Design a binder for this molecule. Structure first.
Ligand code: SF4
Ligand code: SF4
Ligand code: F3S
Ligand SMILES: [Mg+2]
Lengths: 534, 267
């Protein structure tokens, strides 16, 4: 009965971009995996010879899901190459917009991209809304009545009876599936909250446009600071604060309680999807030139040795091309990067992806929520420690539970809760600075003829870095090394499997035609392919 | 996935960043939930669909072959170089998938500057030979309604579809095939700072007092005078727009803006 043979999932849906996952399964469990990115755009080639000021506008287009992050990375990169120290208000505003991006991104990921792997939407039709309301009100200070939940059931029922399932068309859960465990009531609660999230995210996104112009693709950053003088007004700050308070209430009363109910029901997922090494860049600075001045601090960990967090050395990163569709096999540090495409087809000459393979000290590293949380916890971060301990106590599990697909999903939640609270602190600090009479948001600068610079951002998916080599005042070389490249890139010239490839080994596959288990682990990493290849 | 009542929509992703998909999620009155539940039947969409792999391909095949017909909404440019090798989904080139699916649609909407004119990946030296939908598929007679912008205002997509469903036809289009009801005016003629422009009151730098006072951004490279879009009127996320946030327009709804509007900070 246990299946043995190949499984290909192309396209992997409910992620950003074009991913092809190939695995070899033996006796119902995965024994080998390949992460193949199937679209190349070549933004780094396009950037050559252009004005450095223009970079952020091209690079933001690397991705629309993690929208503002690349604009911030490029700007921090040119700010750095140029030697400018932006005003206090510029850092506050840039930080507040990034904080809002995290809340919007994670809420949408849990409900809209991840949840369908655990929730059987059709099973909500057979639930008792009165019992479901009892359950919902017991897990949250927010009380919901039988009437509240019946309203959702009625809407869902009519939709299903049309025969046009749309997004749910050939869903892996249709007709039931052995890997789906939720009872009808919990499925109904989760569905009501999925629908509710669709509207709440518009408000979470709006928060970014208050200071940022619009979302997607913000337009308020410039070398030297920001352009939004309107962000200084009490009216705009109040508008932002109101959106923030509502978004935080949703995180606290809806997202987290749901995460915990689902995790408790899927406790067995603490046994799959673990990884060995972690890297994180830190985020929310007080000093733009000091990574250790950030609310979350940078750090690297090998083989889960969290008692020995090592410092982050930027010169230790090299991107490999041996198993990628580029010329040759020489790995390069970003300031000496090369982007020379040469397609050989799937596995042609042992190459199978458009993504390069970043290695730290020759090692494959996981980056993202799990790495930021575990590293900050280990560094003694008070807020991260408090919330993680509460989550572990609620679930009745040990810390070892974190090294898994369930742990990675939980860490995304923990990160959202801590950041939501922190935006409130950053806001007060911003308010206090304005109160002192500081109304400056942009500083003057000058373009050098020859220089090098780098910008670091810890985005919702992990450590992001943009690298520039300026020659004759123009872009001599520009290279992007993004979170997903780290986690979803292919094997290197030493044949080390990437974090996603390695975590898939040992994954059970109940059915082989509806491999939801592969999706559970792949989605826990929150893949972004446009980001990874660029 | 398809049947009677609700109109069928097939959403395709070529060489794109997903910013156009995200913009539709920002829909406001109607919101996205109303759109998917009552207004239309979203039958294929790689970003939010439940099915994956062969099941997704099956869902796609099912939608495109329906006797009820479908409307195609396309995001991203089509890479043409080296036989279309630079972009593949389910191991088929994007050129091939679009060549066979688009001619079968009742109507096709190219959503976003990438899908309409080539976009970011088509900028010099265009390594992948990326093209806009109408350019790449001219030989096949494909003529998509172009909704430009990077990303466009979602108000423009919903407005166009609602018009098509009501009138069973495309609205009036300009020479670039964009609806005149949303792209008939330059951003500049609708700008709150136009009075400053007329007075020659230009901000010389972003840190200046004139910038803080809201002076015109033309000297700082604003492309508003050469760009067609409805940004100052509709605004984004019901609250803001590039120049109201103090930054110049980069001409994102125009044909080869990455090369034509660059350097962004010069006029
Ligand atoms: S038009 Fe712009 S926002 Fe839309 S897919 Fe292209 S790069 Fe992304
Ligand atoms: S800021 Fe731009 S769009 Fe507004 S008046 Fe000046 S040139 Fe025109
Ligand atoms: S950059 Fe684009 S979003 Fe509007 S203000 Fe200019 S056409
Ligand atoms: Mg790169």
């Amino acid at each position: 009965s246990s299946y043995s043979g190949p499984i290909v999932v192309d396209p992997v849906t409910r992620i950003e971009g074009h991913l092809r996952i190939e695995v070899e399964v033996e006796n119902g469990k995965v024994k080998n995996a390949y992460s193949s990115s199937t679209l190349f755009r070549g933004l780094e080639i396009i950037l050559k010879g252009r004005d450095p000021r223009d970079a952020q506008h091209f690079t933001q287009r690397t991705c629309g899901v993690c929208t503002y992050t690349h604009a911030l990375a490029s700007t921090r990169c040119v700010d750095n190459a140029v030697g400018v120290h932006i005003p206090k208000n510029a850092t506050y505003i840039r930080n507040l917009v990034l904080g809002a991006q995290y809340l919007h991104d994670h809420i949408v990921h849990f409900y809209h991209l991840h949840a369908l792997d655990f929730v059987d939407v059709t099973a909500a039709l057979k639930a008792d809304p009165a019992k479901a309301a009892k359950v919902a009100s017991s897990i949250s200070p927010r009380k919901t009545t039988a009437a509240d939940l019946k309203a959702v059931q009625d809407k869902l029922k009519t939709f299903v009876e049309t025969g046009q399932l749309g997004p749910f068309t050939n869903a892996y859960f249709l007709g039931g599936h052995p890997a789906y465990y939720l009872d009808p009531e919990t499925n109904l609660i989760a569905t009501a909250h999925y629908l509710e999230a669709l509207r709440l995210q518009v408000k979470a996104a709006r928060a970014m446009a208050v200071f940022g112009a619009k979302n997607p693709h913000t337009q308020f950053t410039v070398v030297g600071g920001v352009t939004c003088y309107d962000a200084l007004t009490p009216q705009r700050i109040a508008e932002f604060e109101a959106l923030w308070k509502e978004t935080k209430a949703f995180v606290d009363e809806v997202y987290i309680p749901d995460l915990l109910v689902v995790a408790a029901a899927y406790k067995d997922w603490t046994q799959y999807g673990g990884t060995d090494n972690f890297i994180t860049f830190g985020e929310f600075p007080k000093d733009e030139y000091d990574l250790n001045s950030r609310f979350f601090k940078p750090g690297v960990v090998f083989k889960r040795d969290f008692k020995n967090i090592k410092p982050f050395d930027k010169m230790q990163i090299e991107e490999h091309v041996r198993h990628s569709w580029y010329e040759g096999a020489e790995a390069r540090h970003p300031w000496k990067g090369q982007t020379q495409p040469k397609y050989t087809d799937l596995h042609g000459d042992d190459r199978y992806s458009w993504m390069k393979a970043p290695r730290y000290m020759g090692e494959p590293m996981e980056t993202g929520p799990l790495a930021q949380v575990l590293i900050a916890y280990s560094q003694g971060h008070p807020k991260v420690k408090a919330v993680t301990d509460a989550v572990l106590a609620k679930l009745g599990v040990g810390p070892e539970a974190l090294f898994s697909t369930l742990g990675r999903t939980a860490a995304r939640g923990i990160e959202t809760a801590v950041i939501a609270e922190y935006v409130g602190v950053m806001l007060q600090e911003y308010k206090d600075n304005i109160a002192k009479g500081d109304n400056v948001i942009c500083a003057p600068w000058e373009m050098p003829k020859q220089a090098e610079g780098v910008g670091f951002v810890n985005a919702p998916r992990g450590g992001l870095s943009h690298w520039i080599r300026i020659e004759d005042g123009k872009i001599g070389n520009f290279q992007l090394v993004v979170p997903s490249t780290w986690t979803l890139g292919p094997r290197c010239d030493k044949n080390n499997v990437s974090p996603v490839e390695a975590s898939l080994i040992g994954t059970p596959v109940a059915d082989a035609k509806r491999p939801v288990e592969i999706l559970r682990t792949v989605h826990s990493f929150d893949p972004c392919i446009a980001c990874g290849v660029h | 996935l398809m049947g009677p009542r609700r109109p069928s929509v097939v959403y395709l992703h070529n060489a794109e960043c997903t910013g156009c998909s995200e913009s539709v999620l920002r829909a406001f009155e109607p919101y996205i939930d109303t759109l998917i539940l009552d207004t239309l039947s979203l039958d294929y969409h790689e970003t939010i669909m439940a099915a994956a792999g062969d099941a997704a391909e099956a869902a796609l095949e099912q939608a495109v072959n329906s006797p009820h017909g479908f409307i195609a909404v396309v995001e991203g440019g089509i890479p043409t170089a080296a036989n279309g090798i630079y972009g593949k989904v389910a191991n088929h080139t994007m050129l091939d998938i679009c060549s066979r699916i688009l001619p079968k649609a009742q109507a096709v909407i190219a959503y976003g500057t990438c899908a309409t004119f080539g976009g970011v990946q088509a900028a010099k030296p265009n390594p992948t030979g990326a093209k806009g939908v109408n350019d790449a598929l001219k030989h096949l007679g494909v003529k998509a309604i172009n909704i430009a912008g990077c990303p466009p205002n979602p108000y423009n997509l919903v407005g166009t579809i609602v018009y098509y469903l009501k009138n069973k036809a495309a609205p009036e289009l300009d020479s670039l095939n964009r609806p005149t009801m949303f792209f008939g005016q330059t951003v500049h003629e609708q700008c709150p700072r136009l009075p400053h422009f007329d007075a020659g009151e230009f901000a010389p730098s972003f840190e200046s007092e004139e910038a803080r006072k809201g002076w015109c951004l033309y000297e700082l490279g604003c492309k508003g005078p050469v760009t067609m879009n409805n940004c100052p009127k509709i605004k984004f996320n019901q609250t803001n727009w590039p120049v109201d946030a103090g930054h110049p327009c980069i001409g994102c709804s125009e044909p080869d803006f990455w090369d034509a509007m660059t350097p962004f900070y010069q006029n």
